[PDB]
Amino acid sequence: SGLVPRGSHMTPQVNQVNLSEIKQVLKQQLAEALYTEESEIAEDQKFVDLGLDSIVGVEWTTTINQTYNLNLKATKLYDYPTLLELSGYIAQILSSQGT
Known part of the structure; x- marks a missing residue:
């Protein structure tokens, strides 16, 4: 995932939802x-x-949940207090709902 926003220019309607894109x-x-x-x-x-x-x-x-069409609760914030781990989990949920 070589997706690094730096503010050089905007990103188009990217179809995919990579780990970093969610992050x-x-x-x-x-x-x-x-x-x-x-x-x-x-x-x-x-x-x-x-x-x-x-x-x-x-x-x-x-x-x-509404952004990636999932079901999660407060316990998530407590399990993954950082975006790195939070995104890590989400990326697998949406990747399973479409396979």
Whole structure:
């Protein structure tokens, strides 16, 4: 996955949903949830360290499901406090629902 957003130019309607493609989106979705910008969020930093709580984790877990058409809960935030692992799991769910 040589998909690295740098802000040089926009990305088109990419059909696929690679691991990194989900990872970058997750950062963006969670940035707004933490009242910040994804530009300052790390991929291996814990959402909780930034301020992800029990409330935000439950609402955010839903937006994720709606984005990739899955079923997940608050326990996900607790199992994968970083985008790296979070995305790792999601990528397998959508890859199984279509095979």
